[PDB]
Amino acid sequence: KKVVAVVKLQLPAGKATPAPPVGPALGQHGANIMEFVKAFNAATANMGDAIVPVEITIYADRSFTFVTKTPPASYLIRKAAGLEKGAHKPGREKVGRITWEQVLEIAKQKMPDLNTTDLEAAARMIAGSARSMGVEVVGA
Amino acid sequence: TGADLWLVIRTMQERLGARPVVMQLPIGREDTFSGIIDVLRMKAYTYGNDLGTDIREIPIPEEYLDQAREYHEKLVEVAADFDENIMLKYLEGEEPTEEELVAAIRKGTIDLKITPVFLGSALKNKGVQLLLDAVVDYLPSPLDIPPIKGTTPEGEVVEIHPDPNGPLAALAFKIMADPYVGRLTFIRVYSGTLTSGSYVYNTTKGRKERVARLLRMHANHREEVEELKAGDLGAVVGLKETITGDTLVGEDAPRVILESIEVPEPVIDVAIEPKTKADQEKLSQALARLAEEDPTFRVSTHPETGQTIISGMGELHLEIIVDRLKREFKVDANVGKPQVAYRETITKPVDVEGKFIRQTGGRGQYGHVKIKVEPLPRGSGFEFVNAIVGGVIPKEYIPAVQKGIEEAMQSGPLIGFPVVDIKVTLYDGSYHEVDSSEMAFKIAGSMAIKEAVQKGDPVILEPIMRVEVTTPEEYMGDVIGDLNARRGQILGMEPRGNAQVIRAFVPLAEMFGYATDLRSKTQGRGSFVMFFDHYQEVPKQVQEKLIKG
Amino acid sequence: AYIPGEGHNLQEHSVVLIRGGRVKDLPGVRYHIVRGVYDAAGVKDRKKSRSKYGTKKPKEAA
Amino acid sequence: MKVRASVKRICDKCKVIRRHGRVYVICENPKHKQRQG
Amino acid sequence: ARLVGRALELTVGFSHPVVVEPPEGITFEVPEPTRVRVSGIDKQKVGQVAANIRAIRKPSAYHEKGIYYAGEPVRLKPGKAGA
RNA sequence: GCCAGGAGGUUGGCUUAGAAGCAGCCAUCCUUUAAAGAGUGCGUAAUAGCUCACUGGUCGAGUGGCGCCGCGCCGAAAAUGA
C-alpha cells in the first residue's frame, strides 16, 4: 500500500544503479531509472553527460512519473577556463581564464537554478564563485 | 517467553524475501498456550498437557476463532496465484474443499513458493503429530523430485529416473565407525535395486566392491533389509574403500558418474608444531583419519620456511579438532599464528668497490668489479644490462658473473631473505686472462651484492593481501571500523545483490584470523576471498623489533 | 628416496612406496618413490612410460 | 576521568558545580566525568 | 507491570517479581502493565518513589531494556566494543 | 529560557578509495533575506541528521564578560594515643 513516492536524488547522466535512497524509497516503488539512462541521457543530447537531478513517483497504484534538472557550476569553470580538473588551492594557483566576459552566458544557462532566480544579479555571484575554484578573472 | 508468529512472517520477507502463507494459529502466548487452531481442515485442535497423554478436538472457547477467517482467506486467495479453479472460486464465495487445498499448498511447495508455517513446542508435547501430518500433507518424495543431475561416461547430461528396472546408480555420504559390522556407509542410492550380498563398482577409482548387509537405522534397532530401494537410503556394510560423497554404481550401472559439485571453502588458517616435533607424523596419519571420515579442512604445507599450516572454514572447527587432537592422538600442540613470507630490499643507487686483491695457492683468483646497483617499484622485478665499457670483463663472466648477485639475493644481509625489486647496472671492472676463472669473478659479484645492500639501505617487505569483504552495509560500517583499525586500507566498494562488497588492502601479519573477527563485526552475513597481491615495508619500527639476530 | 624424476608433486606426505635401486648420484637413491601410490601419480603428457610415470592412457578422444 | 588534581570544562556541554564541599565537573557525557581528586 | 493487591508487583527480568507498597499520601495506578503511574499529593514522593522504581530496574545498558521515567534511551554500540 | 526562521550557487578548489560546514591543505565568493556562517560541537561508509551561530515572535528587567585585591576550598598518604 505504497501511497506516493515522488522521491528525488542526485543522479548524474548515465548511472543506472538503484541503491538507497533508490532502494528503500524508489525500489520500495518500482521506479525505473532505466528510463533515466534511456529518456534522460537521450534528453541531454547537448554534449553527452552531466550531473542532473531526477524525481520519480509511485502513485498508490504502482505507476512512474519523473522530472529532471541541470548540471553543476564547478563544471562551468572546468570545461571552460582550461582548469583540467582542479587548481589545487583556489587562492594561490589561479589556472584558467574567466574574465567579465564568458561568465555572462555561463550564469545565463543557469538562471532558474541559483538563488535570486534572475540574471541581473547572480552575474557577480558566479563571477565571485570563480575564486571558490580560483580562476583569474581578468579586469575587463 | 516472547513467543510469536507475526515477527517470523515479517523477518522472512525482511531478510531474504520469502512469502510464508500459513496454516494454523496458536491458543496463547508464553505459558498462555493450551492447544492449536488450524486453517486447513478448520479443526479446533488441542492436546491437554506437557507430555500430552491426552488430546482433543474441543470447540474454540471464542476469543480468536473469527480472526482465523481473515487470516485463513489468504490461503484460499493465495491459491489464486498458482491454481486454476480458485480464481473463479474465490471470485465466488463457494468453499474450496479440503482436497485441492492440500494439492495447492503442496503445489507451491514442491514448486518452491509457499510455506505452511506449521509451528509448535517440543518438550511439552504440544505441536507434534500435527506437524507430522503437515510433513505428509506437503512434503513430497523422490517422485516429485526433479531429474537428478549426473553425468554420462562420455560427459553429457543424464537424467537419473527412479528406474527400479534399468540402470543401478547410487551415491553415499556418511562414514560411520562401528565395531560390529565395521566401516559403515550411509548411502543414497538413486536407481536400480541393491540386494544384501550383491556387489557394486567404485565410480571414480574402479573397485567392484562387495555389499553384504543392507541395513537401515530403524530408530533403536537397525533393520536388516535384503534389498535397498530406488531412492530410499540406508547404511550398507562393507565397501571397505568407499569415501564421502563419492559416486557408487552397481555391477550393471554402466560406469557412469554423478555430479554434486559440492564444495566448502576455508577462511581461518592456523599453524602447528607440537612437543619436540616427535609428534608430527603421528598427527599426519591422524589427519589421514581427519579428512577421510569427513573432508572439511586442509593441511597445507608452508611454501617457504618450516612448519605445516592447518587451515579450514569454521573456527572452533579447528579448535574442536584441537579438542579431539589431545584426545585420541595425545599431542602437546602449540597451534598459533602462522609465519610471514618475508622478502626484503633496498632504497638507493650505490656504486661499490668489489675489489678482490688475491693470489691464493696459485691459479690467479680475483675479481675487481666497479659495480653499480639500483632498485625498482614495489613488486616490479629484476633486470640488468651488460654495461660493458668496451669489453673489460670477458664472456665467461656473463653466464654466472651475475649469479653471485642472484645467489646473494637469496639472503639479503640483514635478516636474510630473497631480495626482489632491484635493477643492477654495473659499469666497470678489472681482470686478467688467467687471474679470472668463471668461479672467481662470479664470486666477486657475490661480494658486490652483499656490501652493496649493506651500504644501499635496509628495508623488508611484509606480504600484503587483497581481499573482498562481502558484507551487508550496517556492519560494513563496523568492518570499515576494524579494517581501518588493521594497519591498512580497503581501496574498493560496490553494492551487490543482497549486500555490498569492499575491495580491500590488508597486511597479512595484521589480517590473520579475520574470518572469526568479521563474524561478530557483522553478526556474520558473508566473508571474502583470500586474494594475494604484493608487499610493502613495515614502517621501520614495526620492522625494528622484527629485527632479531 | 628419489622420484621418477622430472616434475614432482609431493609437498610433505604422499606415502611413496619405497621401491629400490641406487644410482651414481644422491649418495643413496635406493628405495625409490613410485609415481602411483598415495600421490604423485605421474606426469600428465607422458606418452610412454605409462607402466610407471602415472598416466592411465593417452586417450586422444578428439 | 574522575579524580585528578586539575579538572575542567572540555566542550560547550561540560559545566562545573559544587557538591559536599568538593569541586565537581559535570557534562551529560560521563566520559568527561571529573572531580577534584 | 502487574498491579495485583494494593501493591505494585513487577517482574523486570530479575529472577523474581518485585513488591511495592503504597505508603502514606500515595496510591499507584497502572493503566496497563506496560506503563505505570503513581498517585501522590507531595512533590518529594513523586521524584523519590518513581526513582526508587527505576532503581528497582536500571535502563538500557548499551542496547535497550528496563525502567525509565519518560526519558531518552541513549545506546552503546552492539556487536563490537568487546576486544 | 520559550515559538520560528535555521537558505542558494555547492556536493567550495585540492587532496582523498569516498573528504559534500564537518580526518587534514588552502579557504579568505557573492546572491534571495528580518536573519542562515562556505561553520559551534555532535552524528556518517562518505551521505543523512541533532544542534548551534544569527535575526525577528513571546517575555518584560537589568546582563554577558575581562583583570586586581582580603580571606579561605581542593591540591595534601606513615608507621604506640590523640
PDB file of N, CA and C in Angstrom, chain B residues 302-305 339-346 378-379 406 408-422 453 458-464 508 532-538 543 546-547:
ATOM      1  N   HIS B 302      53.636 -25.281   4.507  1.00  0.00           N
ATOM      2  CA  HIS B 302      54.299 -23.992   4.320  1.00  0.00           C
ATOM      3  C   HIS B 302      55.187 -23.996   3.080  1.00  0.00           C
ATOM      4  N   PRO B 303      54.938 -23.064   2.145  1.00  0.00           N
ATOM      5  CA  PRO B 303      55.717 -22.998   0.904  1.00  0.00           C
ATOM      6  C   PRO B 303      57.174 -22.571   1.112  1.00  0.00           C
ATOM      7  N   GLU B 304      57.438 -21.739   2.117  1.00  0.00           N
ATOM      8  CA  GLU B 304      58.790 -21.225   2.322  1.00  0.00           C
ATOM      9  C   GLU B 304      59.559 -21.857   3.476  1.00  0.00           C
ATOM     10  N   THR B 305      59.328 -21.381   4.695  1.00  0.00           N
ATOM     11  CA  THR B 305      60.027 -21.939   5.850  1.00  0.00           C
ATOM     12  C   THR B 305      59.339 -23.196   6.382  1.00  0.00           C
ATOM     13  N   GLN B 339      53.511 -18.176  10.048  1.00  0.00           N
ATOM     14  CA  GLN B 339      54.672 -17.379   9.703  1.00  0.00           C
ATOM     15  C   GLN B 339      54.270 -16.230   8.791  1.00  0.00           C
ATOM     16  N   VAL B 340      55.267 -15.475   8.336  1.00  0.00           N
ATOM     17  CA  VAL B 340      55.053 -14.393   7.384  1.00  0.00           C
ATOM     18  C   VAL B 340      56.094 -14.502   6.279  1.00  0.00           C
ATOM     19  N   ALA B 341      55.655 -14.872   5.079  1.00  0.00           N
ATOM     20  CA  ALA B 341      56.553 -14.987   3.933  1.00  0.00           C
ATOM     21  C   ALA B 341      57.292 -13.669   3.691  1.00  0.00           C
ATOM     22  N   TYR B 342      58.555 -13.614   4.102  1.00  0.00           N
ATOM     23  CA  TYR B 342      59.310 -12.361   4.098  1.00  0.00           C
ATOM     24  C   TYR B 342      60.333 -12.225   2.972  1.00  0.00           C
ATOM     25  N   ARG B 343      60.310 -11.076   2.301  1.00  0.00           N
ATOM     26  CA  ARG B 343      61.296 -10.744   1.278  1.00  0.00           C
ATOM     27  C   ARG B 343      61.674  -9.266   1.447  1.00  0.00           C
ATOM     28  N   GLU B 344      62.952  -8.931   1.288  1.00  0.00           N
ATOM     29  CA  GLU B 344      63.426  -7.576   1.585  1.00  0.00           C
ATOM     30  C   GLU B 344      64.152  -6.921   0.419  1.00  0.00           C
ATOM     31  N   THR B 345      64.521  -5.653   0.581  1.00  0.00           N
ATOM     32  CA  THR B 345      65.162  -4.897  -0.498  1.00  0.00           C
ATOM     33  C   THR B 345      66.020  -3.709  -0.035  1.00  0.00           C
ATOM     34  N   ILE B 346      66.232  -2.761  -0.947  1.00  0.00           N
ATOM     35  CA  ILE B 346      66.973  -1.533  -0.659  1.00  0.00           C
ATOM     36  C   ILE B 346      66.141  -0.301  -1.031  1.00  0.00           C
ATOM     37  N   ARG B 378      57.565  -1.188  -6.083  1.00  0.00           N
ATOM     38  CA  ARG B 378      57.086  -2.310  -5.283  1.00  0.00           C
ATOM     39  C   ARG B 378      56.440  -3.425  -6.099  1.00  0.00           C
ATOM     40  N   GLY B 379      57.190  -4.507  -6.282  1.00  0.00           N
ATOM     41  CA  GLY B 379      56.696  -5.695  -6.955  1.00  0.00           C
ATOM     42  C   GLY B 379      56.927  -5.707  -8.455  1.00  0.00           C
ATOM     43  N   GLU B 406      72.484 -13.120  -8.018  1.00  0.00           N
ATOM     44  CA  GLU B 406      71.289 -13.945  -7.835  1.00  0.00           C
ATOM     45  C   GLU B 406      71.371 -14.806  -6.579  1.00  0.00           C
ATOM     46  N   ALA B 408      73.343 -14.196  -3.716  1.00  0.00           N
ATOM     47  CA  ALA B 408      73.308 -13.337  -2.543  1.00  0.00           C
ATOM     48  C   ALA B 408      71.921 -12.735  -2.364  1.00  0.00           C
ATOM     49  N   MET B 409      71.167 -12.679  -3.456  1.00  0.00           N
ATOM     50  CA  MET B 409      69.794 -12.211  -3.403  1.00  0.00           C
ATOM     51  C   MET B 409      68.978 -13.119  -2.503  1.00  0.00           C
ATOM     52  N   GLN B 410      69.265 -14.416  -2.555  1.00  0.00           N
ATOM     53  CA  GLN B 410      68.543 -15.404  -1.754  1.00  0.00           C
ATOM     54  C   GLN B 410      68.585 -15.118  -0.251  1.00  0.00           C
ATOM     55  N   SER B 411      69.559 -14.334   0.193  1.00  0.00           N
ATOM     56  CA  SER B 411      69.615 -13.965   1.602  1.00  0.00           C
ATOM     57  C   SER B 411      70.182 -12.570   1.810  1.00  0.00           C
ATOM     58  N   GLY B 412      69.296 -11.580   1.719  1.00  0.00           N
ATOM     59  CA  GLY B 412      69.649 -10.187   1.919  1.00  0.00           C
ATOM     60  C   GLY B 412      70.181  -9.940   3.312  1.00  0.00           C
ATOM     61  N   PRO B 413      71.390  -9.365   3.392  1.00  0.00           N
ATOM     62  CA  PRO B 413      72.237  -9.205   4.579  1.00  0.00           C
ATOM     63  C   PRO B 413      71.519  -9.218   5.937  1.00  0.00           C
ATOM     64  N   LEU B 414      70.631  -8.251   6.164  1.00  0.00           N
ATOM     65  CA  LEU B 414      70.003  -8.029   7.472  1.00  0.00           C
ATOM     66  C   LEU B 414      69.469  -9.293   8.153  1.00  0.00           C
ATOM     67  N   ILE B 415      68.247  -9.673   7.789  1.00  0.00           N
ATOM     68  CA  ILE B 415      67.571 -10.819   8.391  1.00  0.00           C
ATOM     69  C   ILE B 415      67.564 -12.047   7.467  1.00  0.00           C
ATOM     70  N   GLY B 416      68.150 -11.894   6.280  1.00  0.00           N
ATOM     71  CA  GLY B 416      68.326 -12.992   5.341  1.00  0.00           C
ATOM     72  C   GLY B 416      67.086 -13.462   4.599  1.00  0.00           C
ATOM     73  N   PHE B 417      66.686 -12.723   3.564  1.00  0.00           N
ATOM     74  CA  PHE B 417      65.533 -13.086   2.732  1.00  0.00           C
ATOM     75  C   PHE B 417      65.764 -12.684   1.266  1.00  0.00           C
ATOM     76  N   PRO B 418      65.116 -13.389   0.314  1.00  0.00           N
ATOM     77  CA  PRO B 418      65.218 -13.061  -1.114  1.00  0.00           C
ATOM     78  C   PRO B 418      65.028 -11.575  -1.392  1.00  0.00           C
ATOM     79  N   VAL B 419      65.881 -11.016  -2.242  1.00  0.00           N
ATOM     80  CA  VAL B 419      65.879  -9.582  -2.486  1.00  0.00           C
ATOM     81  C   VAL B 419      65.295  -9.198  -3.856  1.00  0.00           C
ATOM     82  N   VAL B 420      63.968  -9.035  -3.920  1.00  0.00           N
ATOM     83  CA  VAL B 420      63.291  -8.572  -5.137  1.00  0.00           C
ATOM     84  C   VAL B 420      63.176  -7.046  -5.160  1.00  0.00           C
ATOM     85  N   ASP B 421      62.724  -6.509  -6.296  1.00  0.00           N
ATOM     86  CA  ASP B 421      62.616  -5.060  -6.578  1.00  0.00           C
ATOM     87  C   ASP B 421      63.937  -4.352  -6.924  1.00  0.00           C
ATOM     88  N   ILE B 422      64.837  -5.029  -7.646  1.00  0.00           N
ATOM     89  CA  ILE B 422      66.161  -4.470  -7.964  1.00  0.00           C
ATOM     90  C   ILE B 422      66.471  -4.446  -9.452  1.00  0.00           C
ATOM     91  N   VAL B 453      74.118  -4.017  -0.633  1.00  0.00           N
ATOM     92  CA  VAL B 453      72.904  -3.903   0.180  1.00  0.00           C
ATOM     93  C   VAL B 453      73.232  -3.378   1.569  1.00  0.00           C
ATOM     94  N   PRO B 458      68.609  -0.491   4.227  1.00  0.00           N
ATOM     95  CA  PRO B 458      67.855  -1.627   4.757  1.00  0.00           C
ATOM     96  C   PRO B 458      66.355  -1.399   4.628  1.00  0.00           C
ATOM     97  N   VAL B 459      65.605  -2.482   4.414  1.00  0.00           N
ATOM     98  CA  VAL B 459      64.139  -2.471   4.345  1.00  0.00           C
ATOM     99  C   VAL B 459      63.579  -3.862   3.988  1.00  0.00           C
ATOM    100  N   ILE B 460      62.651  -4.375   4.798  1.00  0.00           N
ATOM    101  CA  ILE B 460      61.933  -5.603   4.448  1.00  0.00           C
ATOM    102  C   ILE B 460      60.610  -5.248   3.788  1.00  0.00           C
ATOM    103  N   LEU B 461      59.880  -6.261   3.333  1.00  0.00           N
ATOM    104  CA  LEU B 461      58.590  -6.042   2.694  1.00  0.00           C
ATOM    105  C   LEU B 461      57.555  -7.079   3.150  1.00  0.00           C
ATOM    106  N   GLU B 462      56.766  -6.743   4.173  1.00  0.00           N
ATOM    107  CA  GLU B 462      55.742  -7.659   4.687  1.00  0.00           C
ATOM    108  C   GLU B 462      54.686  -7.952   3.623  1.00  0.00           C
ATOM    109  N   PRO B 463      54.381  -9.243   3.403  1.00  0.00           N
ATOM    110  CA  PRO B 463      53.443  -9.680   2.360  1.00  0.00           C
ATOM    111  C   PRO B 463      52.052  -9.083   2.538  1.00  0.00           C
ATOM    112  N   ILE B 464      51.597  -8.335   1.538  1.00  0.00           N
ATOM    113  CA  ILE B 464      50.283  -7.700   1.598  1.00  0.00           C
ATOM    114  C   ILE B 464      49.237  -8.542   0.876  1.00  0.00           C
ATOM    115  N   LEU B 508      48.210  -9.013   6.004  1.00  0.00           N
ATOM    116  CA  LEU B 508      48.527 -10.403   6.393  1.00  0.00           C
ATOM    117  C   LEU B 508      48.961 -10.601   7.853  1.00  0.00           C
ATOM    118  N   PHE B 532      45.744 -12.995  -2.775  1.00  0.00           N
ATOM    119  CA  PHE B 532      47.103 -12.460  -2.668  1.00  0.00           C
ATOM    120  C   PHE B 532      47.376 -11.309  -3.654  1.00  0.00           C
ATOM    121  N   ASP B 533      48.217 -10.357  -3.249  1.00  0.00           N
ATOM    122  CA  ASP B 533      48.614  -9.262  -4.136  1.00  0.00           C
ATOM    123  C   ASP B 533      50.131  -9.063  -4.195  1.00  0.00           C
ATOM    124  N   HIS B 534      50.662  -8.187  -3.339  1.00  0.00           N
ATOM    125  CA  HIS B 534      52.110  -7.936  -3.278  1.00  0.00           C
ATOM    126  C   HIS B 534      52.611  -7.675  -1.847  1.00  0.00           C
ATOM    127  N   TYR B 535      53.581  -6.773  -1.693  1.00  0.00           N
ATOM    128  CA  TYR B 535      54.115  -6.435  -0.367  1.00  0.00           C
ATOM    129  C   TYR B 535      54.686  -5.016  -0.190  1.00  0.00           C
ATOM    130  N   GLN B 536      54.721  -4.563   1.066  1.00  0.00           N
ATOM    131  CA  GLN B 536      55.258  -3.252   1.455  1.00  0.00           C
ATOM    132  C   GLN B 536      56.110  -3.352   2.723  1.00  0.00           C
ATOM    133  N   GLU B 537      56.823  -2.278   3.058  1.00  0.00           N
ATOM    134  CA  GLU B 537      57.668  -2.263   4.255  1.00  0.00           C
ATOM    135  C   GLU B 537      56.869  -2.055   5.540  1.00  0.00           C
ATOM    136  N   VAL B 538      57.367  -2.623   6.632  1.00  0.00           N
ATOM    137  CA  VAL B 538      56.760  -2.436   7.944  1.00  0.00           C
ATOM    138  C   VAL B 538      57.406  -1.255   8.661  1.00  0.00           C
ATOM    139  N   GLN B 543      59.269  -3.175  11.703  1.00  0.00           N
ATOM    140  CA  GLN B 543      60.418  -3.948  11.246  1.00  0.00           C
ATOM    141  C   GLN B 543      61.489  -4.074  12.332  1.00  0.00           C
ATOM    142  N   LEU B 546      61.163  -6.668  14.789  1.00  0.00           N
ATOM    143  CA  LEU B 546      61.249  -7.829  13.931  1.00  0.00           C
ATOM    144  C   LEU B 546      62.673  -7.983  13.397  1.00  0.00           C
ATOM    145  N   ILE B 547      63.547  -7.027  13.707  1.00  0.00           N
ATOM    146  CA  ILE B 547      64.977  -7.252  13.505  1.00  0.00           C
ATOM    147  C   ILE B 547      65.557  -7.971  14.725  1.00  0.00           C
TER     148      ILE B 547
END
